[PDB]
């Protein structure tokens, strides 16, 4: 009967840290990994929590795998669905006018289309008063984009946020809680060596925000400190 989070993209980085943090707060976790990555930090974590962490497989860019996960989990209910999975393009220093079509397509599919297909397909596994979240980025804020850089990633997260606003409009005036999280610039393999925050300086706050967002209907764009991020 323990509360359970379905955490999509939990193999490493922020997603793995989120799984560890929910487990420390007494929740169960179903976390997803991609089949191709071999053994991950999440596999090591599952050995420490053998009865409380379950690992499922999902590449979010494969719609058949999203449906397969939905079928596997159809006898389960999740208090929170959180889509952490995201990446960046091979060469983030390229401007939008320099990126290859393949790189543009790949990142828009991975970061914008695919998290939305996950939430649309798996929303039924969450109660109607539950919480659906996606890991966005402060870089997806258009109002805050005064400096550019990381051009393709920025557009992918801006598109994600807009898609999520339209999803939220279809749930207007219902109890569903929704959140786009900006975790801060964190020293993971994605954030890089110059990132301002350690994992432990971001993830407890993200988890605090998610727990507090439950029961507060509607979509918000919130950072790891609970501050509203401008669209």
Ligand X SMILES: NC(=O)c1ccc[n+]([C@@H]2O[C@H](COP(=O)([O-])OP(=O)(O)OC[C@H]3O[C@@H](n4cnc5c(N)ncnc54)[C@H](OP(=O)(O)O)[C@@H]3O)[C@@H](O)[C@H]2O)c1
Residues that bind a copy of itself (CB under 8 A): 1-3, 25-27, 30, 50-51, 54-55, 64-65, 67-68, 70-72, 74-76, 79, 129, 175, 208, 210-215, 217
Residues that constitute the known binding site: 11-12, 14, 34, 59-60, 84, 86, 153, 157, 186, 188
Question: Which residue in 24, 25, 37, 128 binds ligand X (CB under 6 A)?
Answer: 37
What lies within 8 Å, CB to CB, of 157 at 6+ separation is 86, 111, 112, 136, 137, 139, 140
Do 180 and 84 form a contact (C-beta atoms < 8 A)?
Answer: no
Q: For the sheet containing 218-223, what is the strand order?
A: 53-57, 28-33, 4-8, 80-83, 131-135, 177-182, 218-223
The minimum distance between CB 76 and a copy of itself, in angstroms, equals 7
Q: Is residue 141 near ligand X by the rule CB under 6 A?
A: no
Cβ distance to a copy of itself smaller for residue 47 or 194 = 47
d(CA 221, CA 231): 8
Cβ distance to a copy of itself smaller for residue 26 or 97 = 26
d(CA 155, CA 158): 5
The interface partner of residue 130, options being a copy of itself, ligand X, Cl ion, none and the CB cut-off 5 to 8 Å by kind, is none
The footprint of ligand X on this chain (CB under 6 A) covers a number of residues equal to: 28
Cα-trace Rg, the chain: 17
User: In degrees, to the nearest 5, what angle opens at C-alpha 228 toward C-alphas 222 and 231?
Assistant: 90
Between 199 and 218, how does the x/- string for binding to ligand X read (CB under 6 A)? --------------------
The minimum distance between CB 213 and a copy of itself, in angstroms, equals 8
* Residue 96: how many other CB atoms lie within 10 Å: 11
Summarize as ranges the residues that interact with ligand X (CB under 6 A). Answer: 9, 11-15, 34, 37, 40, 58-61, 84-87, 110, 135, 137, 183, 185-186, 188-191, 195
């Amino acid at each position: 009967p323990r509360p359970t989070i379905l955490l999509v993209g939990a193999s490493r980085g922020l997603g793995h840290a989120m799984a560890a943090e929910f487990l420390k707060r007494g929740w169960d976790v179903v976390g997803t990994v991609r089949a191709d990555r071999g053994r991950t930090p999440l596999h090591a974590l599952a050995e420490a929590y053998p009865d409380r962490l379950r690992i499922e497989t999902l590449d979010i860019t494969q719609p058949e795998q999203i449906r397969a996960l939905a079928a596997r989990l159809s006898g389960r209910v999740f208090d929170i669905l959180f889509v952490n999975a995201g990446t960046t393009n091979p060469d983030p220093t390229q401007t939008i006018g320099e990126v290859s079509t393949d790189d543009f397509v790949d990142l828009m599919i991975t970061n914008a289309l695919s998290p939305m297909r996950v939430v649309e397909t798996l929303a039924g596994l969450v109660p109607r008063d539950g919480l659906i979240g996606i890991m966005s980025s402060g870089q997806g804020s258009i109002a805050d984009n005064e400096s550019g850089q990381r051009e393709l990633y920025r557009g992918s997260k801006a598109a994600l946020n807009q898609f999520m606003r339209s999803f939220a409009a279809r749930h207007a005036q219902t109890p569903l809680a929704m959140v786009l999280i900006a975790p801060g610039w964190v020293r993971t393999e994605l954030g890089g060596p110059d990132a301002r925050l350690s994992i432990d300086e971001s993830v407890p706050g993200v988890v605090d925000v998610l727990l507090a967002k439950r029961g507060r209907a509607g979509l918000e764009y919130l950072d790891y400190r609970g501050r509203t991020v401008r669209w």
